[PDB]
Structures are given as C-alpha cells and as structure tokens.
Symmetry: C2
Subunit: 289 residues, 2 copies
Amino acid sequence: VTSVWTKGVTPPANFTQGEDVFHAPYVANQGWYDITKTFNGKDDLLAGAATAGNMLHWWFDQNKDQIKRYLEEHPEKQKINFNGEQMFDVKEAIDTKNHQLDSKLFEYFKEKAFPYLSTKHLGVFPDHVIDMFINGYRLSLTNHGPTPVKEGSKDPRGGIFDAVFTRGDQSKLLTSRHDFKEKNLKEISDLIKKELTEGKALGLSHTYANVRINHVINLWGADFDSNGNLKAIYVTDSDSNASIGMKKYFVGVNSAGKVAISAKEIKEDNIGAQVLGLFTLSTGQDSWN
Amino acid sequence: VTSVWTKGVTPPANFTQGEDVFHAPYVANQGWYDITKTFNGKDDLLAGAATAGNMLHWWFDQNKDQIKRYLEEHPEKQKINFNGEQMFDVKEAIDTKNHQLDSKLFEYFKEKAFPYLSTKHLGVFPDHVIDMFINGYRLSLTNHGPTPVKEGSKDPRGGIFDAVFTRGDQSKLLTSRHDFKEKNLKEISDLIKKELTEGKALGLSHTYANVRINHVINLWGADFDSNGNLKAIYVTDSDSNASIGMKKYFVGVNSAGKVAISAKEIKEDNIGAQVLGLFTLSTGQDSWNQ
C-alpha cells in the first residue's frame, strides 16, 4: 500500500499494540500534537477546539518565522487584554505548544474563549475556531454552516493575525469544511488524499456516544491501497488518556457502503464510527507579504 | 396609612387603575428606574441584571458627585476595553440611565456581560451583578450563596469603582441578601420597612413561571397599615412592558399561610406570588468620605 502524511509530520515509530488500540505514545517535536481534555467542566465538549488547537500548533511550526516577523511588525497583536486582565499571549502559547494537558492555547480556549459551551451542551467546529483566532471572524454559536466570508468587526477573542489574514477576502481564508455523510469510500479517499498532499492539516468528524452524536479528531496520516482507497488513518483524539498518543484506525465499509473507522478491524460485530466530515487548515505561508 | 419610600425617590402621582393592575406610567428624574426587557433573545432571562441595573442607576444618583470625582482621579476606570473593542463606558451609562428600553447599562449586561445566560436557562442574582460591577468580584454562575468577602482578581467585566470599594474587605461590600424562609408577615414587613429606612435600594424575589420559580423585581415604596404591617408595595418589573411603570402590589398571607404579593387583593380565590427573598444596595457614601 501507499501512505501520505501531513506536511512536516514525522511518522511515529514507537507504535505498540495495546488492549484496545494500536498506538504511538506522544513524542514532542515530531511535528504532530495531542491536546488532551481534563474534563474540568469547561473542555468536556470542546474536542472541536482541541482539534483546532492541534492544527494551530502545527500552523505555528510551519510559520515559525513568518509569525515572529509578524509580531515584530505588530507587537500589539501578541497579547489579548480584557479591561486590565491579560487573557492570552501568543508567545506563551508557542512556548507551551508541545504540552498535552496544559498548553496555553487550549487553556485559553476552555477558560476564556469558550468557557460556557460545555455547560450548554454545545461544541465548536475547528474551522470556526481557527477562523476566529486567525482572521478574527466573529464566532457565532448559531452558525451551523461555514464562516460567511465577509467584512465585519473582529472577534475580541481572536484576530491575532488579521493584519495579514483579513475578513471578507477569500484568499485569506485558510480553512475549509467538507460533508461526508452520504459519500462513498472513493469520494472520501480522494478528498482526503488531495488535502493531505496540498500540505494541509486535517480534522475529521465522526459519529460518537455524545449528545451531539459528533466527535472530531486530528487526522495526521493515511494508508491507501493499490487502487487509492483508504485502509487506515493515524489520528490524535482529545478524549483519549494522555498516555495513548497517536492512534491507528482501520477504515472500512459496511454492506450499505457507509465508511466507518475503528481502533479494531471493521469486523461485523464491531461497526466502528461512521465518518461525517472533514476540516482543513492551510499554512498560507506565502501570503504574509 | 403610613408609607416608606426609597431614599431619593419621589412617589408617583399618576397612578391609574388599569385592566389588570394599579400602576403609574414612568416619568424620569423621579429617583426610580424601570429598565425594561425587549425580549430580543439576550435579555429574556435577565430580570436579575435589570433589577441590579435599576439599583445601580439609583446608586448613580446618590453618588453623583463622588463618582464624578472618582472618574476624574481614575480616568482608566471609565471604559471597559476588550482587545481593542469598547465594551462599556460608565459615562454613557450615566447619560442614558433614565431610558427604560435602551439604557446603556442594561445594553452592556444583555449584549456583553451576560449574553449566554438567556440560552442556558440561567439567571443572575442582583447582588452578584452589583458586586462585580462595583467591587470587581468575580461573578460565579454556580455560586448559589452570597458573594464571598475574600480577596481575588478583578472580574474583567466590572470593578469600575474598585479603587474605593475593594474585594476582600467586609466594610466595602455594599450588598446584602435575605431569605424569607420560615418568616412571617411581621418579620417581613419589619425587614423591608427597616431596609428602606436605612437608606438602601431593595430587590424583592418571588415565585414565578420560570425555570427557577424565582423572579426578581425592584421594591421602591411600601405602604403600612396603622399597626405597622405591610399592606402594599410599589415596584418596577422588567417583565412588564414599558407603558406600565410603577406597579402597586397588595401584600397578605394567602390560604396556605404564606406571605404573598399580587396586583389584586389576596383572597381565597387569589393567593398571589409567594415572596422568597430580598436584596439590598447601600450608597456606601461613607467609604467615599475616606
């Protein structure tokens, strides 16, 4: 078979077979991330923000210099202050980006940005989160669809890099969302391969045992068969115990052609989780000018 | 019968027996306020913040000169900024305090301070709102008790006058909360009568058709019979439309032995709403003098 990995992401080599899943314990500075939930009451339903978080850490690595230069030109942007209190400092985020349980970026997400969502049985989508943090698109909880590419006031909680990535200009939107509900294996496989080779970071949503019946994770790499159809994917899941890390999921189909994923073979008693959607983040590396 | 009115409040003189209630249409600069919900989805469940708002407007009047000097000496406290965006301007609040529907203080509460609450079936208590706005005490949605008089960081949403009214100092807490549990018609009358006499603004909580079966309103005046027993009260209610204004409520023990209030006399066929508690705000102009 053949495989494709997220740009700048080193395939783990510490993969071991456990009781429930084949995984690779987290290793820092390997290109990938694994933000972990503590279910402190604030991040209980924020896997979407956890997924956006992991994609943002990747994004930091990719634009390491592009960012340092950006801040120098706009020192104002480095921090987010609320009537005297410092809510966030991007450099603190970058310095803690490798921390699973206490990265400053996720801390900002659960504590200051989206504190009440978990209490309202509401989650968030990776793209909205990223669009807010970067472009400053005002994140609205009633927006069931993509970010409406328009001009408008910046969201106080984000817009750190909106001096470069503006609102209302399609060439500055660095994210995308795709529906997989009624797609077959070929369709899903092609889209995912394409995105992974265009150097984008990927987020995958699938059915789950939660109120929303939707859970999102990071998809770092994928294996394709001789015909180019998915056989497995490598993911990071914010719901997992920090000690698990990178997870290997099988990718299969049932007699109705629905695509599902699982930590075990899609063997008729275990049906896995049906895939529902895909989100992406491009570095936009050549737009900082 | 003797009546007792809130300090600085002039009794309405335009009461008219309406369809369902005896009320006095709102007139500005009479000392009392009537912030009114628009039910725009954000203020639908913020009766607690509107009551706090009306109390804070009263507080603006009582401490006008002191606030003027305070803002002069602490320029930075006038505005609340969030990463480049202006969330609030106390002077705009003061300038628009007389408005029932679009006062700037209530706009700030429904739009920026407590927007999410009306989508969480959650309400706020008037004392917590005031403690956050004045002292800067962090408002906790889970705290079902009084504001803990302990030190701590300032809530970014308030602390406007915390250079004077600090956190952690019991002499700087200007609010109080009282429960009418296991209390009788006389203990209640005395408390209210007393709070009103001590020059404080009052908030009254009672049973209501909402998730918590608890709705709060402002208690501006109170009539007492020749024996000193509460007979009626004059309140403003953020759930009433803007044309109502000051409402008169009868007070009395219904057939279940509970003290209640109603827009009509308490009878066998009218048990009214059961009172649950009181909230108060003192001017604190003694701390201004320091």
